[PDB]
C-alpha cells in the first residue's frame, strides 16, 4: 500500500527498493513568438531513480530529441519514464532487481504497472510523503550533466557521497531530504549556506561538500532555520 | 406459446418471469406460467418472503425441453426440472389450464423490451458460463462468484465469464504499452472479438447476460463484468460502426429497464462518466446518453 509517516523505516530495511521521481523528465521554457503567441521550448530532463538504503542514484538523462514530433508530451513523459525504469530493472541482475518501486507522483502508477507486467512480483507503490526530489536539478553537478548531454545517457552517482561510512541510511536520507527541502524552498539561501566557506570543498567524485561531523550539525541547523523562516513568510504566521 | 407448470407452491414467495413478477402465498394453489413466448431465452426467479437475501432463478429455453418447478423441502427452494415423458407433461399442463391455475406471461403487444434485452443471448452460451451439463437450464443466484473474482473458491458454482483485464499481458502488446493502454482497439478487435468471442453477437450476448444477472439477482460479479465489456468498447478508438449503433440500443433498453431505486449500486459512476463524456465513443451513444441524463443526472 501507500508509503506514509507510519511505515517510514521500511525504506531502510534490506528489501531492495527504488524511488522514482518524474518531475524533471519533461522541462520547458515558456516564451512569446514573433506574432505574440506563447510557445514552449523543451530542455533536457532526467528521471531520478534512487535506492534510499544505499544512496545509489540512476540518473537517466532525457534528451530533447525524445519529444520531436510527439503530441501530448506531459502524458508521454509518464510513459517514457516507465519505459526507462522498466529497462533499468531488466538491465540489473536478478538479485539486484527491486522488490518495490515507490513513485513520488500517483500519475506514474498505471504507466509503470503496465510497463512492469513482466515483473508481477515487483510491487508498484504510491506515497503520501511530500518528497522534495524535484529539487535534484538544484544540485550543481546533476544539473550540469543533464544540460550538457547530447544524447540519451545514464549517469550513476551516490547521492550520499561517503556519509554512510559514518551514519546510518535513516540519518543519510533525513539529511538528503532536508538539504533538498531547503533548496526547493529558497535555492539561493540554501546554496549560500552550503558554499559560504571556501575552505570546505566538494570532492571530484562527490556532490556535496566535505563537512566534518560538527560542521554538518551547523549546516543542518541552518537549513532548518531557513525552512521555518520561509514558512512564516509564505503564510504570514 | 409454452408453459412451465409448478407442482405446488408450499412457501410464500415472489416469483419473477423475465421482467414481470407475482406474489404467491404459502400453499396458494399456483400451478405455473403459460403463454411464454417461444423464440427467446427466459428466466424464472424467486425471492422467499422470509429471506430477502439470495434471489435465485433459472435460465431456460422451452425449445430445449419440457421444464417445471417443484419445491424441495430438504434444500428449501424451488427447483427447476425436466420431464422427459412428453405425454405425461402435456397431460399435466392441460389439466392445470383446464382448472385455470396458471398465470399468463403478461406481454403487451407493443412491447419489445424482452427481445431488446435478450437479442444476442443464446442458451448454448449461457450453459458455457454456468457449467452444469446434466441440465438444459441454468441456475444463478445472488451470491455466485465469477472466475475472475475467484482468482483475486468452489469452481462448480462459478460464473465463467470471459476474463477482461486492462493491465494484463493479454491486453498489452510488448512495445505498444502506452498505445494499447490508451486505445484498447487491439484488445477488443483482435484478442476478444476475432480471438475469443469470434463475433460481436456472442460478445453482446455475454454483456446482456451479465446485465440481466446483475439486475435480477444483484449478482455483483456480473455487474463488474457488464461494466468491463462496455468500457472495453468505449475505450477503443476503432470500433465497427454496426457495433456502436447496436451498443447504443442495447444500453438504452438496459438503462430503461433498471429499477430506479437501484441505480446507486448497479451503475459505476466512473465507467459511465468515462464512456459517455471522456472516451473515444463519447459521441456515439446518443440514445443511451439522453436517457442517462434525464433519468440519472445525479450519477453524472
Cell 464512456: give the residue.
B275
Of B102, B120, B143, the position where a domain reaches its end is B143
B167 touches chain A (CB under 8 A): yes
How far is residue B299's CA from residue B263's CA, in Å, rounded to a whole number? 8
Residues B205 and B76 in one domain: no
Contact B130, B140 (CB under 8 A): yes
Q: Are residues A47 and A13 in the same domain?
A: yes
Q: Which domain holds residue B49?
A: 1-143
Interatomic CA distance for residues B110 and B182, integer angstroms:
42
Q: Hey, are the CB atoms on B178 and A111 less than 8 Å from each other?
A: yes
CATH number at residue A199: 1.20.80.40
Collect all residues of chain A within an 8 Å Cβ-Cβ radius of residue B171.
none
A216's CB contacts (< 8 A; 6+ apart) are A175
Is residue A101 located within the same domain as residue A216?
Answer: no
Cα B279 versus chain centre, distance? 25
Whether the CB-CB separation of B47 and B23 falls below 8 Å is answered with: no
Neighbour-count burial of B257, counting CB atoms closer than 10 A to its CB (0-12 exposed, 13-18 middle, 19+ buried): middle
The C-alpha cell of A237 is what? Answer: 504566521
- Cβ contact A114–B177 (<8 Å): yes
Could A113 and B178 be called an inter-chain contact, meaning their C-beta atoms sit closer than 8 Å?
A: no
* Residue-range definition of the domain harbouring residue A59: 9-163
The DSSP code for B195 is I
One domain, residues A37 and A18? yes
Entry resolution (Å) = 1.7
> Cα–Cα distance between B273 and B275 in angstroms, integer?
6
* H-run or E-run covering A143: helix A140-148
A-chain residues within 8 Å CB-CB of B177? 79, 82-83, 111, 114-115
| A76/A105 same-domain check | yes
Breaks (C-N over 2.5 A) in chain A follow: none
A44 in the same domain as A28 = yes
- Alpha-carbon gap, residue B294 to B292, rounded angstroms: 6
- Taking residue A168's Cβ as centre, other Cβ atoms within 10 Å add up to 12
HSE, CB side, 13 Å, CA atoms: give it for residue B121: 25
Domain boundary among A163, A182, A210: A163
* Element spanning B140, H or E: strand B138-141
Residues in CB range of A198: below 8 A, 6 or more apart? none
Instruction: From B181, B201, B175, B188, select the one nearest B230 (Cα to Cα).
Output: B188
Q: What are phi and psi of A45, to 5 degrees?
A: -125, -165
User: Is residue A213 located within the same domain as residue A149?
Assistant: no
Which domain-ending residue is among A103, A138, A163?
A163
Is the domain of A170 the same as that of A141?
A: no
Strand partners, A101: A18, A124
Residue with the three cell numbers 483485464: B165
Q: Are B14 and B77 found together in one domain?
A: yes
User: A141 with A123, same domain?
Assistant: yes
Based on the domain organization, do B169 and B276 belong to the same domain? yes
User: How far is the alpha carbon of B237 from chain A, nearest alpha carbon, in Å?
Assistant: 17
Task: Name every residue whose Cβ is closer than 8 Å to that of residue A81 and which is 6 or more positions away in sequence.
Answer: A20, A22, A25, A47, A108, A111, A112
Closest CA to B116 of B236, B249, B272, B242: B249
User: In chain B, where does DSSP find H-type helix?
Assistant: 86-98, 113-118, 123-129, 147-151, 177-182, 185, 200-217, 220-234, 241-257, 263-266, 269-273, 286-295
What kind of experiment solved this structure? X-ray
Whether residue A113 is contained in a domain is answered as yes
Q: How many CB atoms lie within 10 A of CB A27?
A: 18
Pair B65, B111 in one domain: yes
B246 and B157: one domain? yes
- Domain co-membership, A185 together with A153: no
Amino acid at each position: 500500500g501507500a508509503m506514509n509517516s507510519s511505515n517510514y523505516a521500511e525504506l531502510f530495511n534490506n528489501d531492495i527498493k527504488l524511488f522514482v521521481d518524474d518531475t524533471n523528465v519533461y522541462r520547458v521554457t515558456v516564451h512569446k513568438t514573433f506574432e505574440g503567441n506563447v510557445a514552449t521550448k523543451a530542455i533536457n530532463g532526467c528521471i531520478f531513480t534512487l535506492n534510499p538504503k544505499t544512496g545509489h542514484l540512476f540518473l537517466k538523462i532525457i534528451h530533447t530529441s525524445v519529444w520531436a514530433g510527439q503530441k501530448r508530451l506531459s502524458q508521454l513523459a509518464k510513459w517514457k519514464t516507465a519505459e526507462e525504469v522498466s529497462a533499468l530493472v531488466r538491465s540489473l541482475p536478478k538479485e539486484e532487481q527491486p522488490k518495490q518501486i515507490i513513485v513520488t507522483r500517483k500519475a506514474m502508477l498505471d504507466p509503470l504497472e503496465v510497463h512492469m507486467l513482466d515483473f508481477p512480483n515487483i510491487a508498484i507503490r504510491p506515497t503520501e510523503l511530500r518528497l522534495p526530489f524535484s529539487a535534484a536539478m538544484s544540485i550543481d553537478k546533476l544539473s550540469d550533466v543533464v544540460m550538457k548531454a547530447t544524447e540519451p545517457q545514464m549517469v550513476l552517482f551516490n547521492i550520499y557521497d561517503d556519509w554512510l561510512d559514518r551514519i546510518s541510511s535513516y540519518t543519510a536520507f533525513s539529511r538528503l531530504t532536508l538539504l533538498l527541502r531547503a533548496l526547493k524552498t529558497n535555492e539561493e539561501s540554501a546554496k549560500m549556506i552550503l558554499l559560504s566557506d571556501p575552505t570546505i570543498t566538494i570532492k571530484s567524485y562527490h556532490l556535496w561538500p566535505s563537512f566534518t561531523d560538527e560542521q554538518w550539525i551547523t549546516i543542518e541547523s541552518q537549513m532548518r532555520d531557513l525552512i521555518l523562516t520561509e514558512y512564516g513568510r509564505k503564510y504570514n504566521v | 406459446m409454452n408453459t412451465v407448470p409448478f407442482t405446488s407452491a408450499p412457501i410464500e414467495v415472489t416469483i419473477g418471469i423475465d421482467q414481470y413478477s407475482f406474489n404467491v402465498k404459502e400453499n396458494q394453489p399456483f400451478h405455473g406460467i403459460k403463454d411464454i413466448p417461444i423464440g427467446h431465452v427466459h428466466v424464472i426467479h424467486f425471492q422467499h418472503a422470509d429471506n430477502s437475501s439470495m434471489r435465485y432463478g433459472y435460465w431456460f429455453d422451452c425449445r430445449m425441453g419440457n421444464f417445471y418447478i417443484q419445491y424441495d423441502p430438504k434444500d428449501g427452494l424451488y427447483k427447476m426440472m425436466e420431464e422427459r415423458d412428453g405425454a405425461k407433461f402435456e397431460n399435466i399442463v392441460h389439466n392445470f389450464k383446464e382448472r385455470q391455475m396458471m398465470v399468463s406471461y403478461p406481454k403487451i403487444d407493443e412491447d419489445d423490451t424482452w427481445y431488446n434485452l435478450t437479442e444476442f443471448v443464446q442458451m448454448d452460451k449461457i450453459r458455457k458460463i454456468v457449467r452444469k451439463d446434466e441440465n438444459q437450464f441454468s441456475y444463478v443466484d445472488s451470491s455466485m462468484t465469477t472466475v475472475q473474482e475467484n482468482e483475486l473458491s468452489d469452481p462448480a458454482h462459478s460464473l465463467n465469464y470471459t476474463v477482461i483485464n486492462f493491465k494484463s499481458r493479454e491486453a498489452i502488446r510488448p512495445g505498444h504499452e502506452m498505445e494499447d493502454f490508451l486505445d484498447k482497439s487491439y484488445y477488443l478487435n483482435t484478442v476478444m472479438l476475432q480471438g475469443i468471442f469470434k463475433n460481436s453477437s456472442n460478445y453482446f450476448g455475454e454483456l446482456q447476460f451479465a446485465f440481466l444477472n446483475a439486475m435480477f439477482f444483484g449478482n455483483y460479479g456480473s455487474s463488474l463484468q457488464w461494466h468491463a465489456m462496455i468500457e472495453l468498447i468505449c475505450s477503443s478508438a476503432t470500433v465497427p460502426k454496426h457495433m456502436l449503433d447496436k451498443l447504443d440500443e442495447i444500453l438504452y433498453y438496459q438503462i430503461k429497464t433498471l429499477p430506479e431505486q437501484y441505480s446507486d449500486i448497479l451503475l459505476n459512476e466512473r465507467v459511465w462518466n468515462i464512456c459517455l463524456y471522456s472516451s473515444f465513443q463519447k459521441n456515439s451513444l446518443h440514445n443511451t446518453e439522453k436517457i442517462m441524463e434525464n433519468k440519472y443526472p445525479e450519477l453524472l
